[PDB]
From a paper:
We isolated and characterized two Shigella podophages that have notably different features when compared with classical podophages and instead are most closely related to phage N4. We describe the isolation and characterization of phages Moo19 and B2, including whole-genome sequencing and analysis, cryo–electron microscopy (cryo-EM) structure determination, mass spectrometry, host range studies, and enzymatic assays of the tail proteins.
We used a similar approach as described by Subramanian et al. and purified gp82 alone. We also copurified a complex of gp48/gp49 as previously described. Using cryo-EM, we solved the structure of the isolated tailspikes to 2.4- and 2.3-Å resolution, respectively. The tailspikes most closely resemble that of the tailspike in phage G7C and differ wildly from the tailspikes in DEV, which more closely resemble a myophage fiber. Each structure is a homotrimer, with individual ribbons colored cyan, green, and magenta. Therefore, we tested the purified Moo19 tailspike gp82 and the complex tailspike from B2, gp49/49, for esterase activity using a colorimetric assay. Positive esterase activity would result in a visibly yellow color and increased absorbance with time. In G7C, this appendage is hypothesized to expand the host range; however, Moo19 and B2 have the same host range, so the function of gp81 in Moo19 is unclear at this time.
Author numbering:
A (entry chain A): 196 to 777
B (entry chain A): 584 to 777
C (entry chain A): 390 to 486
D (entry chain A): 196 to 292
């Protein structure tokens, strides 16, 4: 019964349905706050003063916003209450007529409140779970969410882990509530030693809703461990897609920049919300988007971005941070998609998400219905080392990355049954590296004029004759998309050095491998498209959806030397970045 | 996988590169002014750290206990600067920056490039009780990117950094700089680890 | 059949599974880089305070943002063990100590 | 019942408790070694010579050392024994507690 109800609740979450939620627990569930001035008088059947936003309140305001599933809640949380007290509460013996119960008890039980022992806690939490299932409610058990990031509630969390394993017998979904503030500042999220403030409870509720939308209720859920390219409407056991507004166009079009052709689109003049929820099994992850459109697309990645009443200044510091202070300053949420029509077909680096836990990536257009369109063709979430995580590209900080090298042999050395003829290296096309892309072209300007908005790449060319050529590809002039190639080190003589080396930014054109209906009626059903490696258009001359490339033109003073060339393009890139992303 | 750092074997790693743009290219609604590159702080790379300082000695005296890092500097004017940051002297924590390749003329080459090992200081983003009684409960601390102390002068818990000081023979050139610090590191190493 | 060392390895790995939380059905092997501290509870790394004297106190003197300074006091024998299933062929071990 | 007992055992391992462990199996569990000179005479109810350290012995010496959970073991391992023999062993029909 519990598994069936949890499956129904998961389908309601992912189908814009409605769920009635029972919030049962102690002071942490009730939203206890008696320390800060960000309080509201005791409500929801509790005696203690509550924070201005409790976790159930934020859950009920957040899950409908990010998934479209209407949430109505019943409060069965009293400060200082234990499992024995909760089971025998006179007003809680009736069925609240809900669909899912989110149960978090054990902090007060570990303190010996009401004579509670570990065995009593275990027995009465099991009894509560059975009673909740008998009431037709799916059971989501939480570990004891407390303050101090593991420094407090050790016995409470041991009992909570035992209770979670016991609840596995009943097929209960679980939420590791103790780790919702692990990557945050304690001062920013706590009212007292063990209770959260409004922002901490908001974070807890938002992570709970993130687990709901990610498919964490499902027993087949797996946290995101490697890079994934997901699109609107994609079904994975790691990333849960929610169409909150129900108007994301899952239509197939050749105008998409992905091979899945899903153009998942936010129509102009309507408020569309697309959210991707997952458990990030790493300390950090780079967020990339293949998106185009005219109207503003807004991305919210972490906690203070969704809700913040501004009651404390420090609520802004409550975003997920790196655990270690070393060379990791305070992280601010930076999730921007640059909608430059110049790079519309190109990948955009949204930003980074820090911390291990449940994450929601909210993609929404103008909520007032006065904005343009956005097409969320694909979303890339790439877990990275936290020291390699980039908050904002080319920002006021030193971004630690690796040296991405684009290697090619001219002529190719693969499957050459006979020795290939030596060729002259006068023209080749290498993918545009990350360091050369503009940062926020819509705001800071494109490379065409603001030729500082790019970085540099080193073109290392060597041939079988021992001749070496190190070329600094850097933009010194504006008015175009040409990178001046300055020769740094070469084994060539001055009369043998190439006179001018030109790197021209361009996009590959797209070509049809098989037009729809080429082989006959409806064979193939759809056009099978590919990037045309032979057709590339300079930026500004035309638009190409095949990817950012450099048209490298080497001009030789005399007849071009012929040899077997090794071409390497060295440039800075984000760790493990698959595509150069604006 | 590295068994022991700087041991009797060849440790296979990758080339960790610390990239920064001076001035930054992020969210520049207006074109930033060209700046002179005379001082910047880059995190200390792994290859430059001492191996077993308690046993083999620190870089202050045993200036062999460190390795080298290559500082590759390029600007929007096309000027390139490849600097070998290596420790040639003892008695301090200063790495001698030898210029390997530069597009600058001899009279335009920087006279002395100094990489000084240092630790960032720690600063309080929000002292405990700043907003009122118990708000915040605890001090929210961060590394002070503006305050760094040379090793031996003082102790800092903000991470190992290099205080790179570039001395120019004439007035420092102003341009849009691309700074890359190339050094050996363990594959995917997040922090330079002693 | 194993020798003394092989049986010792088998028993030590069995105890490693016990301490890692491998008995639990929610256990997951360690697949990516993790920054864990004393007293941290994860489904991948099992922390055991063998001697029961590791100080899980919070101090600004810690070099981590979690402020857990998990400490082995002087003049007392303290044992802190971290157990996990490594889902890779190798792993680099780093400490902020 | 098995899940509840395994949860209790996991909590004992991670809480410096005490567990009584039954080591049931064949020659590999008993620590069979009749090839090397690193042997000890047949003990723990087995007929075959054992290695100087068997897997259960190392488990009982290792888990308390690394987790603080005291371990006491009962040996029900005989070399050459199968599941049918183990189930119908006359001396193994009693509960080892």
């Amino acid at each position: 019964r519990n598994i069936q109800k949890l499956a129904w609740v998961d389908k309601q979450v992912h189908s814009r349905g409605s769920i009635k939620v029972l919030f049962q627990g102690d002071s942490m569930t009730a939203g206890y706050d008696t320390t800060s001035t960000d309080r509201v008088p005791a409500n929801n059947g509790d005696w203690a003063t509550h924070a201005s936003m409790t976790y159930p309140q934020r859950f009920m305001a957040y899950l409908p916003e990010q998934s479209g599933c209407s949430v109505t809640g019943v409060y069965r949380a009293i400060s200082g209450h234990t499992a024995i007290q909760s089971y025998n509460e006179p007003s809680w013996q009736s069925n609240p007529n809900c669909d899912v119960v989110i149960l978090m008890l054990g902090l007060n039980d570990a303190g010996g409140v009401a004579g509670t022992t570990e065995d009593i806690y275990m027995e009465y939490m099991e009894k509560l779970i059975r009673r909740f299932i008998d009431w037709g409610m799916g059971v989501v058990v939480q570990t004891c969410s407390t303050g101090g990031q593991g420094s407090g509630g050790v016995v409470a969390n041991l009992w909570a882990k035992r209770m979670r394993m016991m609840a596995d017998t009943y097929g209960c979904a679980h939420f590791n509530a103790d780790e919702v503030q692990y990557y945050r500042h304690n001062g920013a999220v706590q009212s007292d030693g063990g209770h959260f403030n409004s922002m901490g409870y908001a974070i807890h509720g938002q992570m709970l809703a993130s687990m709901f939308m990610a498919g964490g209720l499902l027993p087949t859920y797996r946290p995101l461990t490697n890079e994934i390219n997901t699109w609107c409407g994609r079904l994975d056991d790691s990333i849960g897609y929610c169409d909150a507004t129900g108007n994301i166009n899952l239509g197939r079009s050749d105008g998409a920049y992905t091979r899945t052709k899903v153009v998942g689109g936010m129509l102009a003049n309507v408020a569309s919300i697309a959210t991707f929820s997952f458990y990030l099994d790493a300390e950090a992850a780079h967020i990339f988007v293949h998106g185009s459109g005219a109207g503003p697309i807004n991305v919210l990645v972490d906690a203070p971005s969704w809700w913040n009443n501004g009651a404390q200044d420090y609520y802004d510091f409550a975003n997920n941070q790196s655990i270690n202070f070393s060379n990791s300053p305070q992280a601010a949420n930076n999730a921007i998609v640059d909608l430059s029509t110049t790079y519309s077909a190109d990948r955009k680096f949204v930003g980074r998400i820090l911390g291990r836990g449940w994450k929601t990536l909210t993609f929404f257009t103008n909520l007032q219905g006065t904005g343009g369109d956005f097409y969320l063709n694909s979303l890339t979430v790439q877990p990275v080392p936290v020291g390699m995580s980039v908050q904002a590209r080319n920002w006021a900080r030193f971004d630690k990355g690796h040296r991405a090298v684009y290697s090619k042999k001219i002529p190719q050395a693969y499957n050459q049954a006979t020795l290939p003829t030596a060729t002259a290296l006068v023209n080749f096309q290498v993918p545009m590296p990350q360091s050369m892309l503009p940062t926020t072209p819509s705001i800071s300007g494109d490379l065409g004029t603001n030729f500082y908005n790019c970085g540099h790449s080193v073109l290392k060319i060597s041939n079988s004759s021992g001749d070496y050529l190190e070329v600094l590809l850097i933009k010194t002039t504006g008015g175009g998309y040409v990178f001046t190639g300055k020769i740094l080190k070469t084994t060539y003589a001055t009369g043998n050095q190439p006179t001018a080396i030109t790197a021209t930014a361009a996009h590959y054109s797209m070509k049809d491998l098989k037009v729809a209906g080429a082989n006959g009626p409806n064979m193939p059903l759809e056009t099978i498209r590919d990037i045309d490696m032979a057709s590339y258009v300079t930026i500004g001359v035309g638009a190409g959806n095949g990817g950012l490339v450099l048209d490298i033109n080497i001009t030789w003073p005399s007849t071009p030397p012929t040899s077997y060339w090794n071409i390497e393009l060295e440039a800075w890139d984000m760790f493990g970045n698959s595509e150069a992303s604006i």
